[PDB]
Design a protein around this ligand. Structure first.
Ligand SMILES: *Cc1c(COP(=O)(O)O)cnc(C)c1O
Ligand SMILES: *Cc1c(COP(=O)(O)O)cnc(C)c1O
Lengths: 467, 464
């Protein structure tokens, strides 16, 4: 295609996107396809000659959309949100056209410098300590963009185990790094995201999952007991992942208790705030952050609730030296290749910059407040209905609930709802109880959307209960 | 704040701006004249409370962003390896960014998984890869998955190799710790291998040893054979080899016909890093360097280098998907990578392959190689310069005959104007200029223009 055709096709794609995102409520959120559905609808080989743009573009509706889960539907209520926005789109359009790589400052200065200044903006927006700012005079720390919280959590564990091994190796300098690694133990809540287990599996570091209280919250007592038990057995506590907004029921570990324990015992304290971190834009949701001064690292996903399209993860460290010694064989700008697993990285900071500036802080805060109010409204509808119960507290955009009685009633409600797929729910379990997780997603979700989805859930319960 | 009708106006503005930027890019200075820290004073200290105007946001692109950008899409970009964008790549990712689905499981968005499976089978075939790397082949236990980088794909290969061997070692020592057993492992690559190989060992705590190479900077069977016997004699356990097709320094090619047989016989995971040169295997006449690919356990290259897909987009193929899965689980692609979440990267890849078609992708590789061949002829006509390694694809390496200081001062002179972007490399003692043909729009005129700036620089240095 010629540049003049790109100008026409770009317009067709902008007009397509505007219509798609505007009318998304009309779509079946979940596709009704079987595994392998696509192969028989595609040629077995790449085309030798150009396919026409009418043919490629045609295939969006004809064969892509029928297999898509519409993550931007107000009726998507599974997992946690992953929200796009107009500004996000426009910013990545620019980054993808420049298509520079920013492994070093030198390889494209703007790619590193915009990211450095925007991560300082974002740390301030979240109410993070000044020691996570690149530009605070006394700081040895800073923020860097990653693709996922999963990888940011793995990097934190990699930095914690490398740091501790280098300190152990000064005493046993004939001892293999890998042998010293055998003695380490890392902790999280039994509510922690599967990425914590997976970071242990990848790093070959022992991971212990600790019991929680009645609010599904990891407490200092449980960490202190595990540390004493594990040191008595010759293990070397190295790392704690404290979760702010667990995946299951959006619970919060008790940072004010875990912080001092991590500081006194020499454990790297990493905060996984993947979903909930966006709420810290609002001063009234910062109570969960109490104890943040003890953190060695902090991560959240703008790519969940802050209307930046995926990939966009914020990762902040107190000590960029400890991070860089993980990733370089020898220990106002920076080469971000030493703050991450790969070499290459792209100009992800444009889309984050455009979202922050297009909305401004007040409209980002209004979005968080609105989504939370939509979840509160949903909650009030459940709480009013004595057929249902709510087995965990709602703090943000996630309500969990179930029909009173055996798990099978809730199982059968989810099955009935999945038949038409007008809203997308996935089950979880908390201890013995099957629950429905209801995540408020789209920034455009209205009270009418919430009542519409509640009424479908109620119709299904009425069907299952009336037999 | 921004409304749907405003998105349609600003989307048009951005489409027109991008077309004008990519079309006029030769008029830019490829290297920006800035110093570290230049942007901080040009930006507010804090995010804006109220919305900034779209005129202000857009206006900042030229006013404060472009002055610090290295124009990777410039024909005058000749450092590192290419990273090419294209109209169809842009249009596919626009769609992917709007849907914004995540593909950790098939269930979480089937199309994200299924388009990727099918396109990776297309791309395996386009490359001339073994049928055992296809998702849909009756005998295959393998398949292709997109990754963000070759760096991460090489790390995964090594994590899969070391996990598989530790599980085999535990059968005879059930009391030994997985991390204790990892201590005995050793992994190999060429001393020309990309720094991502060294970085994989540093992350995984796997001992890496870098092997000497021959007169063509090729890793040979004998070096591997000698390393393997010496390491076994010391009580280390060979586990992995990374064979490079298209080394960073001089685009040398490891001898896979020799390394293959040894890896298979000795039970070593053989990972192929063809980051740059992979794209060349679209053209059957460059497939000589792929001879011995039937012995590979894994293979990776970047469409995000030379195939005109914008970054990120890396292909990673394994022969044994169960070995890969065992690395990451105590088709759902979350078990074929490090993270859980992943995005719909396959749209822009499908769009590029369909919008160009294979024949035009082959013409692009061949034209880039012709431009490199013309750059080569201009150097080889001029007896002030020499060429210490053979040009197989789009990289020419060359220096001034004489001490390193001559080539050094040429680079420092070219850097003053930044009219083309060149990076120093070394082989043994010799300082070299790498000359990479990048832009798919590169012409003989662009090459001669660029050569004449290197010559004009050389003329000045040679009479100081
Ligand atoms: C979503 C989530 C993650 C995983 O984030 P990715 O960016 O998908 O890796 C981890 N922890 C929590 C608490 C989450 O909600
Ligand atoms: C470019 C290059 C790499 C690194 O690729 P990324 O995708 O940037 O990690 C690795 N190996 C070789 C030979 C390369 O040319």
């Amino acid at each position: 295609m010629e540049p003049e055709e790109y100008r026409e096709r770009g317009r067709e794609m902008v007009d397509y996107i505007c219509q798609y995102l505007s009318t998304v409520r009309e779509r079946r959120v979940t596709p009704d396809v079987q595994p392998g559905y696509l192969r028989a609808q595609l040629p077995e080989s790449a085309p030798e000659d150009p396919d026409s743009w009418d043919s490629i573009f045609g295939d969006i509706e004809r064969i892509i959309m029928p297999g898509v889960v519409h993550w931007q539907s107000p009726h998507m209520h599974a997992y946690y949100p992953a929200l796009t926005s107009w500004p996000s789109l426009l910013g990545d359009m620019l980054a993808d056209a420049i298509n520079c790589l920013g492994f070093t400052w030198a390889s494209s200065p703007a790619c590193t410098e915009l990211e450095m200044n925007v991560m300082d903006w974002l740390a301030k927006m979240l109410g993070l300590p000044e020691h996570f700012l690149h530009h605070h005079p006394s700081s040895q720390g800073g923020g860097v963009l990653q693709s996922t919280v999963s990888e940011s959590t793995l990097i934190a564990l990699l930095a914690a185990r490398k740091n501790k091994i280098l300190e152990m190796k000064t005493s046993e300098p004939d001892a293999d790094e890998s042998s010293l690694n055998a003695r380490l133990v890392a902790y999280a809540s039994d509510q922690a995201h599967s990425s914590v287990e997976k970071a242990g599996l990848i790093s070959l570091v022992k991971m212990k999952f600790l019991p929680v209280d009645d609010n599904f919250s990891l407490r200092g007592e449980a960490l202190q007991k595990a540390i004493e038990e594990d040191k008595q057995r010759g293990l070397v506590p190295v790392f704690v992942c404290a979760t702010l907004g667990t995946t299951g029921v959006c619970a919060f570990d008790c940072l004010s208790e875990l912080g001092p324990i991590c500081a006194r015992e020499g454990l790297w304290l990493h905060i996984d705030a993947a979903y909930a971190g966006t709420a810290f834009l609002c001063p009234e949701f910062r109570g969960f952050l109490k104890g943040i001064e003890y953190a060695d690292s902090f991560t959240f996903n703008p790519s969940k609730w802050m209307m930046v399209h995926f990939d966009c993860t914020g990762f902040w460290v107190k000590d960029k030296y400890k991070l860089q010694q993980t990733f370089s064989v020898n220990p106002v700008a920076t080469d971000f290749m030493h703050w991450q697993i790969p070499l290459s990285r792209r100009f992800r900071s444009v889309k984050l910059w455009f979202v922050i500036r297009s909305f401004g802080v007040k409209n980002l805060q209004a979005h968080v407040r609105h989504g939370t109010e939509m979840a509160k409204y949903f909650e009030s509808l459940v709480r009013n209905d004595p057929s249902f119960e709510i087995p965990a507290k709602r703090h943000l955009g996630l309500v969990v609930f179930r029909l009173k009685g055996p798990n099978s009633l809730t199982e059968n409600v989810l099955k009935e709802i999945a038949k038409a797929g007008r809203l997308f729910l996935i089950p979880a379990t908390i201890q013995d109880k099957l629950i429905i997780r209801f995540t408020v997603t789209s920034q455009f979700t209205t009270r009418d959307d919430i009542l519409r989805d509640w009424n479908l859930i109620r119709d299904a319960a009425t069907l299952i209960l009336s037999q």
